[PDB]
Design a protein around this ligand. Sequence first.
Ligand SMILES: [Mg+2]
Ligand SMILES: [Zn+2]
Ligand SMILES: [Zn+2]
Lengths: 76, 65, 390, 48, 194, 54, 243, 449, 75, 97
Amino acid sequence: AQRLKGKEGRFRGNLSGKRVNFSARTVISPDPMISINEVGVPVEVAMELTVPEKVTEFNIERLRKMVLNGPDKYPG
Amino acid sequence: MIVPVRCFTCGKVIGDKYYEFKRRVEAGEDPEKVLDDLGLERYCCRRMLLSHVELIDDIMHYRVY
Amino acid sequence: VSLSTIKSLIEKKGANLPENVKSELYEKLKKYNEKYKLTKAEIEAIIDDVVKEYERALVEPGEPVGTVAAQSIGEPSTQMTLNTFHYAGVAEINVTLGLPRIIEIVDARKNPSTPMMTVYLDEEHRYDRAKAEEVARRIEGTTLENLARSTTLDLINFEFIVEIDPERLERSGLTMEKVVKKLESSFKSAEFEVDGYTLIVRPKKADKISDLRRFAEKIKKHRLKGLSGVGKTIVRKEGDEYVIYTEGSNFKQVLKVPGVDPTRTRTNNIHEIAEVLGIEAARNAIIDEIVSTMQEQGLEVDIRHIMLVADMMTLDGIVRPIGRHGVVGEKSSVLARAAFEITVQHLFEAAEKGEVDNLNGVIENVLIGQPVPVGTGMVKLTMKLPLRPQ
Amino acid sequence: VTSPLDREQPHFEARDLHGTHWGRICPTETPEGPNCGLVKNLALMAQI
Amino acid sequence: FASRHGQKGVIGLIVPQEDMPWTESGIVPDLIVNPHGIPSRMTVGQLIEAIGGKVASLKGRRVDGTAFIGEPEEKLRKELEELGFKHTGREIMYDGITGKRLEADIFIGVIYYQRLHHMVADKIHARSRGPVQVLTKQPTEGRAREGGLRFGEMERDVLVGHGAAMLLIERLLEESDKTEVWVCENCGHIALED
Amino acid sequence: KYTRFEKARIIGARALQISMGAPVLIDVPPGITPLEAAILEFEKGVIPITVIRP
Amino acid sequence: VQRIRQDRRSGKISDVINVAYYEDVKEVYVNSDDGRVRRPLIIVENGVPKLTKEHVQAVKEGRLKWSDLIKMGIIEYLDAEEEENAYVAMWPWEVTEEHTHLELMPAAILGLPASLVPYPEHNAAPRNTYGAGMAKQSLGLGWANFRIRVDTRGHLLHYPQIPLVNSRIMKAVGYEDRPAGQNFVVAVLAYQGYNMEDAIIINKASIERGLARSTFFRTYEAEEKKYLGGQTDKFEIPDPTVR
Amino acid sequence: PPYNADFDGDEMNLHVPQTEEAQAEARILMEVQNHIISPRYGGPIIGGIQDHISGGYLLTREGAYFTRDEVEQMLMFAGVDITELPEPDKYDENGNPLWSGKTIFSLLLPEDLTVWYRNKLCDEPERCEALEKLIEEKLMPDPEEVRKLAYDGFVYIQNGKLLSGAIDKKAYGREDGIILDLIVREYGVERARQFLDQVTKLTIWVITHKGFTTGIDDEDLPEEARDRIREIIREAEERVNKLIEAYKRGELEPLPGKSLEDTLESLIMAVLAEARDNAGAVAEKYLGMDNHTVIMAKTGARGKILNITQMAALLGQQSIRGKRLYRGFRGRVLSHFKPGDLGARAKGFVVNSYKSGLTPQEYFFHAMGGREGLVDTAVRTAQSGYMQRRLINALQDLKVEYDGTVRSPEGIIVQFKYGEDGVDPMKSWRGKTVDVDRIIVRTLLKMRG
Amino acid sequence: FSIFDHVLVPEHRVLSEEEKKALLEKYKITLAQLPQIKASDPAVKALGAKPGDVIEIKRKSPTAGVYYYYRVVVE
Amino acid sequence: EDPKDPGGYFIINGSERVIVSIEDIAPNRTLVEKDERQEKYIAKVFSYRHGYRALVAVERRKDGILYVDIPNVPKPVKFVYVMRALGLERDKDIVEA
Ligand SMILES: [Mg+2]
Ligand SMILES: [Zn+2]
Ligand SMILES: [Zn+2]
């Protein structure tokens, strides 16, 4: 009965909300030089988070260049 | 823990003038006159000597090898 | 152009507009035409622009308006105060305000913490101060202990003794022989001795050692005149009409009191308006109460969310609270109720009844892990397969 | 100095700064969150 | 960084020295703060300490700032004027980029500031895939064990309010936990795969 | 005409189709991402998906 | 109560005894228990404080101590019960015949961290609370023993400085021997959009010269546990064979 | 403002959608420029704050003028794609050309915008009334006639040319924004985004290169003002003492329904509040428009008049839960007052300002006051959170059907027309279903042109 | 005095069979999917109605000048 | 050690533990409060002996009759009854006490 009740219980702790992958957290600092619909991302976070992309006929060369860059150069 | 070498703002080297200032101000001479004698015109430098506290001397007693 | 032509044009091509819109457009066009000479084409173009704006301002189907309303009510609630004002100002009665008032309204408490009514006088006595005071005197109610300047539980001879204050008499034009007459009419076998600012009670039972104090308090608490439950009353002027504010609440009896305008009298107790005037009047009262409470704090909230809340609460013919014993408790889904509160009781009750959950809501679908039926989750798509590139 | 009450309840009477606190409990040094008014620090003149 | 008057903030920009404006008496600010928080915060004591610090650093000895018996403001204002500066504590500065003096006199002084132990080097945290908890098979908790950020139910309600159903299902299933099971539709019980 | 939910759903379907191997119905600059390709197809008006409304 | 006060001030009984009387209910309360919070006060008699200039001189020269002043009947501690019957003046120049006690130092009513803020009466109370709370979080040479300390976390400011504007209490309590901050040349100006909403802008050259530079410490622990049955851990280079 | 975030240590999370459909949903539904208008009240939520408003006022105030290099540099910094400067507004001595702030600001507005209203800086209603009369008599006034009657309190824009008024929180501030609200509705979200970026950068540059600061002398009142304030305080204290003396001998008139003590307390509080307002009245009038703090307060960028009157003139009464301080010893708050004293000073009235310093009793009373606010916020947050959770669980699954009705998931009809008019509050013209005046006016100016 | 004169009470009227069926058809709803009004409601007494009946309510909302709300009578 | 170290804490398994001071109600104190919910008057005392605490209360209800609450007692007993249980049975003794 305890597992199914409370804020830390199953229903409210592991069903209505949960911890997720591909997420980052850090402090914020002002930047008036970027557009309102843009966010500045640390290079350390950018090389940690990834966006899966499929290879197509119109993006093959860019993906090939990134694969050549490896996991250490920024656009890799 | 020890006197800094240069004033944080302007960069003038004031690392050698701390002991002289302390001795003369202890002897009885007016602190402002001592500072003016040392040539610290801008108060950015005078702050560094006036507010400094010597803390190297009481941490030397603990050694780590 | 003539006003009749404008009126015909408005209803000709702007027929889809809401009624208030069609009337406001006519009023504004009439006002503007005299100051600036308007041509026929200008009127037509203005009407077309209004129609286009109305068309582009409509709500998009599939919009989850309920969550938006809930958030638009909850978010300003972090900015309201708790201590309210706590000031009297003669013409005002202290009442709960801020967040606790909103909580009271939403939870639809059977009896509010600070009941209050606003009584409008009929055309007679409405504008006269003295006549309004007379009507308030008719409405205002008191008991014996209030009139007492002092009270004496005399023990040597075992008689109740009361000392009377002139001010409690003069507040209402009441006089002592009237109080005595009501005392004799409402009880028997009691002395009720008439004295200058003094009254003595000594029945046979209170004459002995056992039945003085208990019967003394019963005599002390009797009301000789006035409406039940209305502890206090205050008169003040709004604009050019005088109105009456009252402590406590009895909506049933006030509408029958002479001099009261029954078409405009309100009370802050929702469960009274519901029983006296019906469910729709209760809905209107809830809307007005929430609007006034949030307006007094300086916060701006659109009326539409409050309409959604009021319509949701006043749906089963009664005024249900929002919470465990109300709207949430009426939800058909077992899992939706279980995730809110008292999960185990709901689960076991559903097991007993053999209840069936159809997963028609949002919370259950989120629990399962399948798209919710709101927003993009309700759109259905089709395509013609033989697609050839161009 | 820590009060033994429950943090979650409002406790408006207990969290308030009493007039007798003068010279016995600091009026300003208090926590920020739910412990505000329930955790307090002795003044400098204080003696136990 | 936080002063002792309750004013706190974070470093927004690190500026090269030659870009910083300089007073016509030869002073370059160590720190620049916005004049906007001062009226709302109503911390006049920080403004008084700013004058007192420069007065102490210029006269060669420290200034007493005891609560109710410290050196009064009027004494410090007169002493600052005695030393050759303006009693308001305002100095003329030149813009570090255009090389011309600003139109208004600028309040500049010396203020004690403290570095707090809330450093970004200990707060930054990102999880790509990480490990998972044994029971719920969800991302762990905390920076120390490559945990994932909490996606609270309020965030779910926000997502619902935006109407983004597919974004919600993406956030709630693939990134955290998902699996396939065998269900016998005849009786509803979960079947066994051997 | 289109609700923003319908537009988002159509673009999301087209982007997934393009990524899974469907040909692009309009010429695109090299190096573009499939989502931007779908958005380009959309604002150019070449949409092969229609929405069912009761 | 007068009889007991005379003995308490003379020295016939212990100082921990406090006596107060309530006129309305005709009750006399005598307190001698444990855990009461009291404050010292100067006894005022016939409109003249019992503390004299030569007593201050003797305290300064080291001839007379605080405990001696307690035993001499010049200063007594008042708990809450006894303070009900008192009428304390704030300053020596406002003492009259009605007053029964004189405040030692009004500035000492504040706590220890709250005493750090200079001119605290010129700030709003919430800001003073925030400053007092944050004063316990800043870095600095907390203790000279830090080098051999084995704390889980630690910090060390490289160039701590004494505040130029300070309260005289902090020197007495020993804070100046262990400062936790530095003096900055601060200009109040909207330099750019990079300092709005409580953001601050700092000079690069000053940072490179040793401004606010700090060091962070963290201690790790490892035991060579001995299990039941004789099996035990071992410190060694892990071979590639081990799982 | 939408995030309610300030850069004092706040941490904010970031999430990356992993699938193409999720990315499309985020790109189409959740773009920032889509949510400029708040759904709660149909007004802007994203807008200029603090330095943006202050720099706008500095740029558009009367008498502001700029040189060739300043204009070119600020236009390049803002990102405006200009390739030819307009005609100079005036010629300085030595023959240098000068450009006014109105001309520079007008280059960011859409070419055909027209609007007029009253901003927060209105102080002489006759000036605004004359401009309103001139605009009302003919819907297109002569610009050279408006420029003779130009007044900072009345904003008026003619075909993208700013002819009168000054920038204020009503211009593009989130709560009172009108220009931004008009742009986002009449030109789409992208034009609003471009306008917002350009105005923010321009105002930031202006405030950077003009110099803006506050100091210890911003509250330096002249001696006559201090004498007036002391006079007001003494009169209030004497009135309170007279009221207490009248009460102590039973001569006080008991107000209706209240106990005599409560009547005395209410009268005392009314007198003290009146006194504080009277002190603020002169404190405001002696600090002119040239003070930077007054600029920050009047334009709505930061703070309000209460902060100024507390810092310069008088703190006023301190109270807890709406009543005067009483939680001390028997009959007195502090042991430094005689028991039974009901005077203003002995119950919490602080006569000093933050600048002049507080006596220890006043300091203790002020701490008593602040603690109530701290605990109020602490409890109010949790109460509001719980109430919002109940509301969310109650109203979660309601939605608008294709037929316009709002239906429960079980099919029960809640509304036969959403909001009883069918208009989304976000798309509404500030609560109104449609703004008839604005449409008529803009149509007339479009066609009469 | 009748409750229909009060400002809080909108105008109620009884729908006959034809408009009842037309309303049920235009929203494609069964009779059980309408908002409920109790037979003990004072408006039901004053107007006069029986369970299973449908009442048309003309509201005076601020957003739209006239709005029509329908309730089904239930005991 | 650091000479500035004030001491006054404990070291348990290498960790520094400090005992904060709890702020309790004064023992053996008769505090009187109003029970307006049931319209009563209550006096409360906390009696301490060998660390044990016992909350003993005497109350006057609306009837004007005194009742005494004792630990490990299900329902409040009559005041005169419990006083009789402690001897002092004389009615005049009650009135004088
Ligand atoms: Mg923050
Ligand atoms: Zn220097
Ligand atoms: Zn099966």
